[PDB]
Symmetry: C5
Subunit: 203 residues, 5 copies
């Protein structure tokens, strides 16, 4: 098996429309945000612009191949894969995807999709200009798949731009299960708390 063959088979048998549940257990999706930049904070309106890598991870056995005599990874256009229907509940603009829309697929069926995204959010910006900073919560989960079909779990400003007007004090993640008044089932989400503040001109 070479790359050409692997990619051909994947394209030929894809089913991007089919959630890869295994024996009616949920697809376990991991989500983690790597913050790159904070761009346009407004303490009056409670709005922020953020750039982040949305590290998204899951398993789709239908993509697996025997890599005994083959590459054990390929990069694949997401239009050829099933992908989780994640959305940020408190986003007030659609995601601006800054990077090539490719996922990495391992021979065992593990998938990693990690685009860089710029997006505007509605959240608590109060205190951004004090020492203890502001804490903005971002809520991400499956739009249409309940907890029996999709579960989401969480996995250092290492990637954060030194040229931002802001700095990161702390990031914490938390998992929730929510029942909305519209539907009888429960839906999982991850809440990411971003604690940040304006740098001093001197800093």
């Amino acid at each position: 098996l070479d790359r050409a063959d692997i990619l051909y088979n994947i394209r030929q048998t894809s089913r991007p429309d089919v959630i890869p549940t295994q024996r009616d257990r949920p697809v376990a999706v991991s989500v983690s945000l790597k913050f790159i930049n904070i761009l346009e904070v407004n303490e009056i309106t409670n709005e922020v612009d953020v750039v982040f890598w949305q590290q998204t991870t899951w398993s789709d056995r239908t993509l697996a191949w025997n890599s005994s005599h083959s590459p054990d990874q390929v990069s694949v256009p997401i239009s050829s894969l099933w992908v989780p229907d994640l959305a940020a509940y408190n986003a007030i603009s659609k995601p601006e995807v800054l990077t090539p829309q490719l996922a990495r697929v391992v021979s065992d069926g593990e998938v990693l999709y990690m685009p860089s995204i710029r997006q505007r959010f509605s959240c608590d910006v109060s205190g951004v200009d004090t020492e203890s900073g502001a804490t903005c919560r971002i809520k991400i989960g499956s739009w249409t798949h309940h907890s029996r079909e999709i579960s989401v779990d969480p996995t250092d400003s290492e990637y954060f731009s030194q040229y931002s007007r802001f700095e990161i004090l702390d990031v914490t993640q938390k998992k929730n299960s929510v029942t909305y008044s519209c539907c009888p089932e429960a839906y999982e989400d991850v809440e990411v708390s971003l604690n940040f503040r304006k740098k001093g001109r001197s800093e």
Copy 2:
């Protein structure tokens, strides 16, 4: 039947172009707005930005399957389904759809489509900065299907999903159904009018 089979059948026998009338009867569409945020009010120009879930509900028996030993629901791309041609009459921008464009389909043919949308409207913003607030009316109906083909009806805490971080707060939401005859065309067209009473905090 598994999900793969159900989704394959749906895609293969699509008909996204065909309104699913069970004939002479109109497709009964339910519409309901869950307000999430109010973003950029202008009392001078009478314009507002709103974020809301557009809960849309209808029946399409051509999607039904026997779920005796199968899943009784799947998520489907709306490009593979017939979808009501709803529009907001007083919108002054096209809808910005913020969420994945999937509808939920039940084995009996019930469909739920509920995108989160950001959109700008022309409406009465006067009094927004007073105690009794402003009342902005949003009018939604089928663009091209008359009352014999599509009927729209209204379906809770008005603020249940509303953002606590908005500069505004919701005082009340009321819904109302209308049947309108336009000068251009002989038939009547239904719509729902949603009245959003809100004010600056």
Copy 3:
């Protein structure tokens, strides 16, 4: 015949690329603007933002069907139909189409396409804040089909204009008049038809807005 059959036939045989001329005579296209809103006037730059329904009407026999025991109308995506290549000559932005892009088709082949459009125009805004108001002319015709292939004609309803106009606009409409022209450009030997819509409007008293 049911709706599914009618729509299937249309999709399978429609030639969206083919202007439906009958016997070397022009397709008669009717155009009419119903104004919904006037949004962002600038008297310095002579620019206006307008929202309007663009009522467009024509005949295409190739869509016809025998409706003896059938529906006599369906809604059809415009991607499955031939559509006139109308453009606004003095537009300075591309049309923002606000509504579902569907046309209504009658069993005899009559087609009605009427999207709501937001668009910016270059025109005479002078006098907008006076009693007699400004008069902005919008010019619409076929971009590439001459008068022997497409003719454009106004239609005046005999009803009041301001019927669909938003009461919440900062502006108000004094009058709307339509007029047909036939023009020959220096690039081309043939004549091209257009409709000129004259929108007479003014700013509402400032006590109200």
Copy 4:
């Protein structure tokens, strides 16, 4: 032959990807700008917004048909035709195409494509608010085809909006052949000089 047949044949045998060179001669493309409006001048940043018809003209013999008892012209979506890969070198925004993207094709294979375009350019805006006005040069040529494959040649105030804040004093056109440090061949372009000024 009727229009339906002509259009069907064109669509079916369409090779939009193939430059229609005849016998190793370059495709001769004519370019001409008809200015409609000047919208948003900035003398500080040297930027202007312009609306113009981009009259583009060339020959593609593979489109020809016998028009003895047939129409001798049709309108065709440009997605079904080869089209020159022209670009404006000093544009700082992508072209906003305002009109239907249709070309006119004559039975002998002559093609005319003339969209109305709004676009922003980087150029010399100094003097715009003086009597002699500013002179803004727009440079247009094939992005990827050299002079042996494509040549560009020149062929307006008649179509200019009376409601613009600006007025046109003069338009001149000029053809150039240029080399670039990246490539050994020569590339043709047209430079259009727009001399304009702010009205009273």
Copy 5:
């Protein structure tokens, strides 16, 4: 062979999804930015708008043909070719591609893709209005292919030969540099080119 045949063969067999590695050796990609304009500098927010030609170069043997009695080059839509998944790490907007999306292909399989791009970046704008100017670094590399699949290198071939004389700014110097980076998320190394643009406001 004529152009029509060459283009037909390429379209029919190209495999835009398949990275053209030759025996486990990485595809060698060359990247070089030719700056055309600097448009909208903001020293407060550390943001700049740049227009540049992104000269991108690589080899794909699967495109080769015998040109004995044929054209030895054609222009090809990039949708019919494999193309490197290059991204600018510090971009804060998606690339606005200003030119026709065509690549030039030589009969031996060499490809040149050079679009003009307008894009906004986050970088160090301090000193832009001084004599020594600001130095803005732009970082470009493969988003998903590691050093064993794609390597990126600067070309060894004027700082402003193509730069607009009508810009409010002027270029003092351009330097390029190659890096190999390991991120915390992944075990492999990823190559990039860092382009340093030293520029200042004209007097």
